[PDB]
């Protein structure tokens, strides 16, 4: 009941009403700003620490061209098929950036010796790491 909210219900964790019984007037309502989209792209790149445009753009078109069920459990599946997120799922680093340095050493051993594609992934199902 409390948990498992809607996957796009992130407007309940930004500003709320009828749960704050004080300050009846002067309540901040959200304006028409696209800066939350730009900072959400910042939340996307900060989960990779990578240069802003090219990687998230290339993963965006790959996420469109892979399958067409939806864009929410599958676009983050395109995020999750990437190798630095995959290493963070294994737990070989404190965070994504340290894992990126570890793969920058080529300490990693994806599919035998090394990933053939270091910056882009993409780990298909059936690929050892």
């Amino acid at each position: 009941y409390w948990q498992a909210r809607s996957l796009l219900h992130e407007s309940n964790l930004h500003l709320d009403a009828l749960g704050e019984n004080p300050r009846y007037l002067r309540l901040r309502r959200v304006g028409s700003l696209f800066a939350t989209k730009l900072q959400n792209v910042r939340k996307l790149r900060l989960l990779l620490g990578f240069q802003r445009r090219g990687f998230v753009q290339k993963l965006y078109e790959h996420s469109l061209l892979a399958r067409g069920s939806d864009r929410m459990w599958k676009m983050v599946c395109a995020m999750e098929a990437t190798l630095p997120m995959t290493v963070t799922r294994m737990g070989l680093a404190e965070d994504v950036v340290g894992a990126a340095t570890a793969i920058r050493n080529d300490k990693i051993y994806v599919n035998g010796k090394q990933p053939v594609m270091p910056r882009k992934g993409l780990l298909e199902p059936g690929d050892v790491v």
Binding site: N111, G112, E124, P125, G126, D127, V128
Partner: peptide
């Protein structure tokens, strides 16, 4: 189908 594809991709490796 994806079990067949997964078993094949795993047993390349």
């Amino acid at each position: 189908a994806q079990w067949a594809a997964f078993r094949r991709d795993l047993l390349f490796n």
